[PDB]
RNA sequence: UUCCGU
RNA sequence: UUCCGU
């Protein structure tokens, strides 16, 4: 039938790295792939995290047959304690599939955001399971090597063809868990024929292969072993395999492992519980590790991206009542700086050097590997699948374009490659693939209070104040009119002209009472001429607040 | 005599990259080495540039025997149109030494900042000249290869020993000007014995050698030659050799060179005038180059660091009335992103890819080389000089420490290495080198209006507004007390509590008039309890403005 | 490809 | 190791 088609709507994850959320539909049965979280750092202060706009999912909260989860990373399972209550409400019998860790981390996230255990249907599946979603989707999951364990891809079987979603991946030949990528299901999918391939474009510009976690472990061992006195190690909290090799090194060289920072304390607790982490002794605290000699200590902490309030940031910018950087410690930044955090990292790195600690970080020391596949690995999957259509995902426009070209360079290139966009509707038939339009989409600013606390406008005029400053005018209606101009964060060129604005507003108030105009209309007779005067006089566009009282 | 000593005071350039300014003194004769400029990007909005605090130079404007300039880059000659008028005033007969370009660029900078030609004594010298400053300092200048031409180092001969200041450098074996580094004067200095070595620490962490500009030229030629249609090229305006090789490539492949952005338009004009740039034809404009076929055009522009208002930024974020990015153009970012501009660059890169232009940048394409020396070159100078004392400069704490270790790894390591700091006093004798204290130092925020327009406090409370938002309260004294609370950029948790603050201030005003307290004291009886309430209620510290009128 | 002070 | 719209 030429009427049959699959609608693919990503509400996040395209033309970007974070907030991964993919929606798949056939006729009237919907299935969602992941519920991601995004981070600010661009120019959004106060905001802790970000969540995608599921306006499509509120509208279709019934057609949602199941929610499938690839892995337990925040950019895949962080949005859910905010997305789930918005869609279904406090409870839902809709199955939410995932691996032990993928769900265990989510469980804890719900235990954090005030939730009854099992309010939502969290159905545990193997990273290699086959799940029949509704009556149109047969989901063949397959293990994929990445930063977080129990990560999977998905061979999405539809009544019109095969969608191969690689998910976040790398072809790590020697992963820390020994649990290698199941390329068999993928090679099997290719033979049958692949209609669409959704592939991780993170390092599509990066040539060659991504170094194995085993090689990073080997290096970490070499440096931790080398260490004179103390050893500090930072990484992304989520990276259980890295945490593992850092532990494996400490244990090898007779060091007791301490752990600080709630994020790493969270992930590890769940991982050690579910048998993903392996400590021969106990994961000590700072209190316990305190008395021990320097060469017998390893303090694992949060602050890989030089986070303003993290443990490593406090260690650099004094600090803790319990811990301070001693001139002798070895600080191992087992991560590479994320773009836009490069300066935050530099300040931290510099600060630690200034304190007297030897700082070890990439590229000098090969102590970090990307969880995402480089060109050679993408080249392999592209040959393994040979799709008709291609949708590069989990990557910015640069990455998606470079992957488009990498796919183009192939022997049997795809018939059509589409650069993915958030909230766009992609119609896929057994013969065609095309964007058929758009749906309501965006992002929601979340903080300590939650969603709705910070709107688009709160930051908008906050930027207006940041970039330009504030000028506040107090206008008094009545027989005795008073005008007072005060300005915070305003240019000295304008502070001189503050005397002129008082008289500029006094005559504007004078005419206001003369015409017996309302206070809501007098403010505008004050606001606009001062605005036009300040732009023509100082060239600055500051925040102007004309307060009108009787 | 054990009383004889040289005081070395850097007012900028240490523990950082920009605003290079070094002060050298013996008895009562001072000489200044460079007058640098710094850039914001950390978290300072509106600010265009930054200048060092010459409070030492105001106090000693007479002992200043001469001002020596190493090269014409802004981080070496940018502060001067602000520093010179502060120190000596509108005119001075104090000699300001420099090479043709070094002074020509300064000339134009003075022609820009309202100055009579020759108000200051700009004495032209060769990058290899010997200048007798006052009666204690014999300055042996020596050519050094770097990004900007006519760059020099200085073998500072004092009545107590030899100071070798390498200045900004790299050992480019094949520079674009063919004018190689004069290591002879340096090797000669070493034989005699080097007391102190002031060396460029920019790439002290970087192993090996910095690639030659000739190799970058060769690559630029390969890519510009390869190009299908249009070619756009961005670099630091200052980089005349790069501009040269980009021209050399266009000319080779029959392309006409256009030039946009005032910064690159400035440097090139002065360079083409003084015989540093070489165009076989004329440096066309966008107007002239408009009609020409795509494969016969090269538009050189500003925006190497994805600058918010630059030509390349406008080309990406539409844009110009004259020029727009066509899906076919080749964009060559002939620069590497400076830390903290990495995101600005990414937005630009992404935007251009989105428009349909092939973007070529490092590391994929070897189109940029650091103007600063890597380990092998520093290793060579360290062996060439073999100093007693060492002061790593033109680099952050990471760089200075790594250079300290690179100096330590040597055969004949220095007796003492000191990590440089701004406004610190370094006393050097024929036998010792030590920090003997500090002097008033810092930085001055400059913009379109100049110095004094933006203070430390303007940005301080501007940050308070950015990070937290504003809450403005209007208080009215008199028989009828009125309280009105308005808040811009405030959290929805606090917007609900705005009703509570009205009543919180109304009772504070009530007691204020009851006690007949002054308006200046009533505001504080309003300010503090609301401050303590907001912190205990919303956990936020916003900008609070209690305006008190009668 | 991040964090969230006795 | 930066920029500053007909
Ligand atoms: Zn991910
Ligand atoms: Zn410089």
Layout of helices and strands, plus pairs?
Two copies of one chain form a homodimer.
Chain A: E1 6-12, E2 14-15, E3 21-26, E4 29-33, E5 49-52, H1 55-59, E6 64-68, H2 74-77, H3 80-87, E7 92-97, H4 100-112, E8 120-121, E9 130-133, E10 137-143, E11 152-158, E12 161-167, H5 184-192, E13 194-200, H6 213-226, E14 231-234, H7 240-252, E15 256-259, H8 262-273, H9 286-289, E16 297-301, H10 311-316, E17 330-333, H11 342-355, E18 358-360, H12 375-385, E19 387-393, E20 395-396, H13 397-408, E21 416-417, E22 424-428, E23 433-438, E24 443-446, H14 456-468, E25 470-476, E26 483-488, H15 492-496, H16 498-514, H17 519-537, E27 543-549
Parallel strand pairs in A: 2-20, 4-6, 6-7, 7-8, 12-13, 13-19, 14-16, 14-17, 15-16, 17-18, 19-21, 25-27
Antiparallel strand pairs in A: 1-3, 1-22, 3-4, 5-24, 9-10, 10-11, 11-12, 22-23, 25-26
One zinc ion binds next to helix 2 of chain B.
The structure holds two RNA strands.
Largest interface comes to: A-B, 60 and 60 residues
Helix percent band of chain A: 25-40%
Approximate strand percentage of chain A: 15-25%
CATH superfamily of the largest domain in chain A: Ribonuclease Z/Hydroxyacylglutathione hydrolase-like
PDB class: hydrolase/rna
Keywords: Metallo-beta-lactamase, hydrolase
Assembly: tetrameric
Entry title: Molecular basis for the recognition and cleavage of RNA (UUCCGU) by the bifunctional 5'-3' exo/endoribonuclease RNase J
């Amino acid at each position: 039938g030429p009427q049959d088609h699959v609608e693919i709507i990503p509400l996040g994850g395209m033309g970007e790295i974070g907030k991964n959320i993919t929606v798949f539909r056939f006729r009237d049965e919907i299935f969602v792939l992941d519920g991601g979280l995004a981070f600010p750092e661009e120019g959004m202060p106060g905001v802790d995290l970000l969540i995608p706009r599921v306006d499509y999912l509120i509208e279709h909260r019934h057609k949602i047959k199941a929610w499938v989860l690839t892995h337990g990373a925040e950019d895949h399972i962080g949005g859910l304690p905010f997305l789930l209550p918005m869609i279904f409400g406090k409870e839902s019998p809709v199955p939410i599939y995932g691996a032990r860790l993928t769900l265990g981390l989510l469980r804890g996230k719900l235990e954090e955001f005030g939730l009854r255990p099992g309010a939502f249907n969290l159905k545990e599946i193997s990273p290699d399971d086959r799940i029949q979603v509704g009556r149109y989707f047969t989901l063949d999951l397959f293990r994929m090597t990445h930063s977080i364990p129990d990560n999977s891809g998905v061979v999405i079987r539809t009544p019109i063809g095969t969608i191969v979603h690689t998910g976040d991946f790398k072809l790590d030949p020697t992963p820390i868990d020994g649990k290698v990528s199941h390329l068999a299901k993928v090679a099997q999918a290719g033979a049958e024929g692949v209609l669409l391939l959704i592939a991780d474009a993170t390092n599509a510009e990066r040539p060659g292969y991504t170094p194995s976690e085993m090689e990073i472990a080997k290096e970490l061992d070499r440096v931790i072993g080398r260490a004179p006195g103390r050893v500090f190690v930072t990484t992304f909290a989520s990276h259980i395999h890295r945490i593992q090799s850092v532990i494996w090194a400490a244990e090898k060289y007779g060091r007791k492992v301490a752990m600080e920072g709630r994020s790493m304390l969270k992930f590890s607790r769940i991982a050690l519980e579910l048998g993903y982490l392996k400590v021969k002794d106990r994961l000590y605290t700072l209190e316990e590790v305190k008395d021990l000699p320097d060469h017998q200590v390893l303090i694992l902490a949060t602050g890989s991206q030089g986070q303003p309030m993290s443990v490593l940031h406090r260690l650099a910018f004094e600090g803790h009542a319990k811990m301070a950087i001693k001139p002798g410690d070895t600080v191992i930044l087992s991560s590479s700086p994320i773009p836009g955090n490069e300066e935050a990292v530099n300040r931290v790195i510099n600060r630690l050097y200034a304190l007297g600690a030897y700082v070890l970080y990439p590229p000098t020391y090969k102590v970090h590997a990307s969880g995402h596949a480089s060109q050679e690995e993408l080249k392999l999957i592209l040959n393994l699948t040979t799709p008709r259509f291609f949708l590069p995902w989990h990557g910015e426009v640069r990455h998606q374009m470079n992957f488009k070209w990498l796919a183009e360079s192939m022997s049997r290139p795809p018939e059509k490659t589409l650069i993915g966009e958030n909230g766009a509707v992609y119609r896929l038939t057994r013969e065609t693939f095309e964007k058929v339009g758009e749906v309501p989409h965006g992002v929601l600013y979340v903080d300590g209070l939650g969603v709705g606390d910070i709107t688009e406008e709160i930051l908008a005029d906050r930027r207006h104040m940041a970039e330009e400053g504030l000028v506040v005018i107090t206008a008094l209606a009545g027989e005795d009119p008073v005008v007072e101009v005060v300005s915070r964060g305003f240019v000295k060129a304008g502070e001189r002209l503050l005397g002129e604005v008082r008289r500029m507003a006094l005559e504007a108030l004078k005419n206001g009472v003369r015409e017996k105009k309302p206070l809501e209309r007098i403010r505008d007779d004050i606001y606009y001429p001062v605005k036009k005067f300040l732009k023509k006089a100082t060239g600055r566009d500051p925040m102007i607040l004309p307060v009108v009282i009787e």
